[PDB]
Nucleic acid binder design. Structure first.
Ligand SMILES: [Mg+2]
Ligand SMILES: [Mg+2]
Ligand SMILES: [Mg+2]
Ligand SMILES: [Mg+2]
Ligand SMILES: [Mg+2]
Ligand SMILES: [Mg+2]
Ligand SMILES: [Mg+2]
Ligand SMILES: [Mg+2]
Ligand SMILES: [Mg+2]
Ligand SMILES: [Mg+2]
Ligand SMILES: [Mg+2]
Ligand SMILES: [Mg+2]
Ligand SMILES: [Mg+2]
Ligand SMILES: [Mg+2]
Ligand SMILES: [Mg+2]
Ligand SMILES: [Mg+2]
Ligand SMILES: [Mg+2]
Ligand SMILES: [Mg+2]
Ligand SMILES: [Mg+2]
Ligand SMILES: [Mg+2]
Ligand SMILES: [Mg+2]
Ligand SMILES: [Mg+2]
Ligand SMILES: [Mg+2]
Ligand SMILES: [Mg+2]
Ligand SMILES: [Mg+2]
Ligand SMILES: [Mg+2]
Ligand SMILES: [Mg+2]
Ligand SMILES: [Mg+2]
Ligand SMILES: [Mg+2]
Ligand SMILES: [Mg+2]
Ligand SMILES: [Mg+2]
Ligand SMILES: [Mg+2]
Ligand SMILES: [Mg+2]
Ligand SMILES: [Mg+2]
Ligand SMILES: [Mg+2]
Ligand SMILES: [Mg+2]
Ligand SMILES: [Mg+2]
Ligand SMILES: [Mg+2]
Ligand SMILES: [Mg+2]
Ligand SMILES: [Mg+2]
Ligand SMILES: [Mg+2]
Ligand SMILES: [Mg+2]
Ligand SMILES: [Mg+2]
Ligand SMILES: [Mg+2]
Ligand SMILES: [Mg+2]
Ligand SMILES: [Mg+2]
Ligand SMILES: [Mg+2]
Ligand SMILES: [Mg+2]
Ligand SMILES: [Mg+2]
Ligand SMILES: [Mg+2]
Ligand SMILES: [Mg+2]
Ligand SMILES: [Mg+2]
Ligand SMILES: [Mg+2]
Ligand SMILES: [Mg+2]
Ligand SMILES: [Mg+2]
Ligand SMILES: [Mg+2]
Ligand SMILES: [Mg+2]
Ligand SMILES: [Mg+2]
Ligand SMILES: [Mg+2]
Ligand SMILES: [Mg+2]
Ligand SMILES: [Mg+2]
Ligand SMILES: [Mg+2]
Lengths: 134, 122
RNA sequence: UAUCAGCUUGUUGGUGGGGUAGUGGCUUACCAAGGCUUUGACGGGUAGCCGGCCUGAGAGGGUGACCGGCCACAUUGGGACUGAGAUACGGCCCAGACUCCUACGGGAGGCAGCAGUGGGGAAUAUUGCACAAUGGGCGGAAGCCUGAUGCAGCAACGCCGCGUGCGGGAUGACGGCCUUCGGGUUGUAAACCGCUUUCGCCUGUGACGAAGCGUGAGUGACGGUAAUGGGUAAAGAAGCACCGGCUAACUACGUGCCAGCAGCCGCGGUGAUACGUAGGGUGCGAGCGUUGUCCGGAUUUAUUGGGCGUAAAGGGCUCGUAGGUGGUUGAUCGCGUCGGAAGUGUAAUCUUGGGGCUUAACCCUGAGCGUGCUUUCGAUACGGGUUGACUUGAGGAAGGUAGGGGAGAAUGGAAUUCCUGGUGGAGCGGUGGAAUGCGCAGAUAUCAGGAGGAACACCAGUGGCGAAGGCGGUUCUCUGGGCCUUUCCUGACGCUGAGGAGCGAAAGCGUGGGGAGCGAACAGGCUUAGAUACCCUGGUAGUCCACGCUGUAAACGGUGGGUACUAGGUGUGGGGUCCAUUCCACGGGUUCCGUGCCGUAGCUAACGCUUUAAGUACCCCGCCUGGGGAGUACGGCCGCAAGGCUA
RNA sequence: UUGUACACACCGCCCGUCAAGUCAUGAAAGUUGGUAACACCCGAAGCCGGUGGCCUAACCGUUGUGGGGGAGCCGUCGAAGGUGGGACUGGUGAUUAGGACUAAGUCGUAACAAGGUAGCCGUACCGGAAGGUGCGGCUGGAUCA
RNA sequence: CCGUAACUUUGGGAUAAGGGGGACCUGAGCUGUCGUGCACCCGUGCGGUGUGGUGGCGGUGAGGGGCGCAGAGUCCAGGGGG
RNA sequence: AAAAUGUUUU
């Protein structure tokens, strides 16, 4: 059964980006919506939208529309899940990870909401290292 | 393996085989020559490699090679035995230190003298 | 360490007393029956622990010398005494083992204090000086004691520093070595010329450590030491390893698979850059090699950081216990998590900033580090706890439905064999060819009748079902699971699952039954050099049934289960639903679940896999760590045995 | 073109007995040690608990002593020793088993090609040895499509 | 009363082996049974029943103590293990 | 249709 819906989101995004799909969809959760929002604010996806259920009439659907540049070029070089259900990863304000030498962003869930490493370091707050999207 | 599998049963290293058990944690050991003889090497080589069955002071008896052209040690000759394998000789894992105790340095050495216990000549 | 699974009876708890500096089964009496343990008790093995040290990019791995902290011990075992304080090292008592004295009655002793001896060992020092300094004991004090300590001796054992010369010198001298006999090389090397004097040697001066101590006088073990002036002579001062590749550096002579070399690959069999020597060279240098040991390289136990289709590796399969793990969401707690504050993390080490030794090693000093822990105050995104919702995961109801799923019983036909009878007569059978064999005592063949056991042609594969092993005559009885469906119900009840349990082809085993055909063993015939085989004729267990046992297979898709996502194309099995003509069905669609083939992205060492993954991901389990030895030995468990399992 | 374990290239490679030697290891009547304990018997020192007729300067006396103490003695515990039966483990052992390596020994040719009977897996029996055969399974075989 | 091996057909081997205690005096409490008696069910006038009785008799006894060379003090009555 | 084998050079 489903164990890590965040990892499911990440793998859905990775597979869709690899297959050059314009949009991907998944069941909605608050943390998924937050990660999608910070992905959009960091420019890794074109946009995102939460849709009220009208096909299954059961639950909200989170849909990410991706962006490909000139000559069909990926805007996401990769995404990786860090804090797995089997083994969870927490980083302090001083030991915050760097992704792609600082080019990519680690997504960290801090006590002040979802914050990209750069943000956390500015606020000197750590938390659970969710992802390494770059 | 999963993280839970590693937690339940961790990694275990290899055994790290020992090479010279008879020395018993010593760089070299004293022994007495219980037998001095020659052995034919394994193929593809061919010779009359000079070896000795030695009763080392650890109580273990092993076969030691005698390096260098020249040889004086015989029955009940006290020798110093160091590590060192002779590849084309099955069962020989030790060598006899020339120039120490009864065994003496190779006579006509002029190069690599220290490895054969040959004093410098004026 | 499970090839140690049970341990404990003052043991676990209670009450009263006793005891002690003190709590306490510490002790005692009485009462109760606890306590510990597969998250590894009990037992075995090894070991003083740490600050640190070595290695490593780090994570780690190895280690516990000096120095510093704690512990334990002082000939072995036990015991108390004295005391503020006792494992009482240089105390006492008893016993044991030792050594010594003895007048034989009895006494004395304990270097794991410092130095030293014997011994063991590859291996580790002087039976030194001083209490001048610092520390300690006693004394009011002068002072006394201090093998603590400060020093010296010894050893290249480690680290660091310095020297063995510097400049000039072509005529590129001799001599070695090589040669193509031209020369090349050693080589600016030498000779020769001019310089310098660190260290060593000779001689002079000569401390600091003492702002101490002492009423004073006086007072430095180290010590004529360090430092330093003068003198001597370029002199008193260079070795070791290596030169086939990794690996910096090559030739000649000698040897001829000999002598020997080697870390691996390998070298030596007459042109050896690999053996031995020489010249030349290279790396290091008061060292250089070898051996031992550790870490690295080794991502070669992979948390960082690996894998399991065929390379070593998926349990034969499922059920299920502990455990691990958890769809959406409200509230709350603030354990994980995160952020401050305080305390602590001695010193030394280590990193780093300053300073001192002529520099360095080393030393002093400031800071950092001390990766944690405790206390306390905050934050609430996530994990978790508590609590309440939701239905999409999961299960259920109702209806629809496919099938060699299983068990039991009865029963159908063909064929084989045997039996009885009729007919008929010379062979039949069998092979590459034969023979053994059967047959005039009538076989083979042929027809009729009967008995019996076993397997179910066609349907039937490109298919169905089952967790796997597997499952095919028909009928009935009993029974398991799957699939679909719009409504319906419950509301995360899910997934996986160590150990454990069950199921598990065939062969095999036990008791009884049955026995047609087939057929290990066996007998004979052939083939053959032989034929313990292939082939042929016979033929017993077995194959069959009932009830058990065994528990293994190339038990294979050599691919664990669950879930989500990622081109298609094209067969086929099952359930729906839609359409037109029907008012059947042919047909097309569409949807859900199977089962094949082709094939993109992607992956793979390749072969190949590719929505039924070996792709992209998350959860849990099993397993691998070079080939043999070996799935073997020993032990234990299971079994009637064969053997299986663990290893 | 297909198969291959051959590449010294089928005059290839390669398997197992037997014979010889060497090394390590297992079994074994036994034999020889070691360690850790257990149950009893005895039990020193000692502390504690009793007792003390004997010995007692401080205390008190009715000044004949008493109090209190001490030697001694007894009891519990108790090191060591004794006795006994087990547990674990090292060496060794006539004899025996297989493993590894070495003649360039003997006997066959089992596998690798359809290896000349396709191979292999489990099991069973048989055989100097490889192996042979039965039963079920696999393709890591193939013929013919 | 404690404890007991190889092996095993799991029954055994086994009384394996190897240990401790025993008698005498005193004796706390615990019990078997009966008991005049208390109350009570009485179907009483039943040949009864359940509570309930200081006691008698018997059994058993923790602890304490005595004596001897010796406490299963005589008779009686396995030796054991390989 | 069965039809075996191929030491040690340097
Ligand atoms: Mg108490
Ligand atoms: Mg020790
Ligand atoms: Mg350690
Ligand atoms: Mg120390
Ligand atoms: Mg005292
Ligand atoms: Mg003392
Ligand atoms: Mg002391
Ligand atoms: Mg002493
Ligand atoms: Mg000493
Ligand atoms: Mg010695
Ligand atoms: Mg002083
Ligand atoms: Mg003074
Ligand atoms: Mg003195
Ligand atoms: Mg080179
Ligand atoms: Mg030559
Ligand atoms: Mg490593
Ligand atoms: Mg290494
Ligand atoms: Mg690997
Ligand atoms: Mg896998
Ligand atoms: Mg494999
Ligand atoms: Mg499987
Ligand atoms: Mg199994
Ligand atoms: Mg559970
Ligand atoms: Mg959750
Ligand atoms: Mg919430
Ligand atoms: Mg410092
Ligand atoms: Mg300086
Ligand atoms: Mg510190
Ligand atoms: Mg919660
Ligand atoms: Mg139904
Ligand atoms: Mg049946
Ligand atoms: Mg058919
Ligand atoms: Mg098929
Ligand atoms: Mg509801
Ligand atoms: Mg089982
Ligand atoms: Mg069967
Ligand atoms: Mg049978
Ligand atoms: Mg039978
Ligand atoms: Mg036959
Ligand atoms: Mg199968
Ligand atoms: Mg397997
Ligand atoms: Mg599984
Ligand atoms: Mg999977
Ligand atoms: Mg499909
Ligand atoms: Mg793979
Ligand atoms: Mg076995
Ligand atoms: Mg080859
Ligand atoms: Mg043995
Ligand atoms: Mg006693
Ligand atoms: Mg006393
Ligand atoms: Mg008195
Ligand atoms: Mg006593
Ligand atoms: Mg004792
Ligand atoms: Mg023997
Ligand atoms: Mg063959
Ligand atoms: Mg064959
Ligand atoms: Mg046969
Ligand atoms: Mg018995
Ligand atoms: Mg007895
Ligand atoms: Mg009594
Ligand atoms: Mg008696
Ligand atoms: Mg009697």
């Amino acid at each position: 059964t489903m164990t890590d819906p965040i990892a499911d989101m990440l793998t859905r995004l990775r597979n869709a980006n690899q297959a050059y799909h314009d949009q991907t969809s998944m069941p909605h959760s608050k943390i998924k919506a937050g990660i999608a929002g910070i992905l959009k604010s960091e420019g890794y996806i074109a946009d995102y939208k939460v849709n009220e259920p009208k096909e299954g009439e059961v639950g909200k659907t989170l849909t990410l529309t991706l962006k490909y540049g000139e000559n069909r070029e990926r805007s996401i070089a990769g995404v990786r899940r860090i804090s797995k259900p089997g083994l969870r990863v927490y980083a302090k304000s001083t030991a915050l990870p760097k992704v792609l030498g600082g080019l990519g962003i680690a997504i960290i869930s801090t006590s002040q909401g979802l914050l990209t490493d750069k943000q956390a370091h500015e606020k000197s707050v750590g938390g659970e290292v969710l992802a390494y999207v770059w | 393996p999963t993280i839970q599998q590693l937690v339940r049963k961790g990694r275990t290293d290899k055994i790290s085989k020992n090479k010279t058990p008879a020395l018993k944690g010593s760089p070299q050991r004293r022994g007495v020559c219980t037998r001095v003889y020659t052995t034919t090497p394994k193929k593809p080589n061919s010779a009359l490699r000079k070896v000795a069955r030695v009763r080392l002071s650890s109580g273990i008896e092993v076969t030691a090679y005698i390096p260098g052209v020249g040889h004086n040690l015989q029955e009940h000759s006290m020798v110093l035995v160091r590590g060192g394998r002779v590849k084309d000789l099955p069962g020989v894992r030790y060598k006899i230190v020339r120039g120490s105790l009864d065994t003496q340095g190779v006579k006509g050495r002029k190069q690599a003298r220290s490895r054969y216990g040959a004093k410098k000549e004026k």
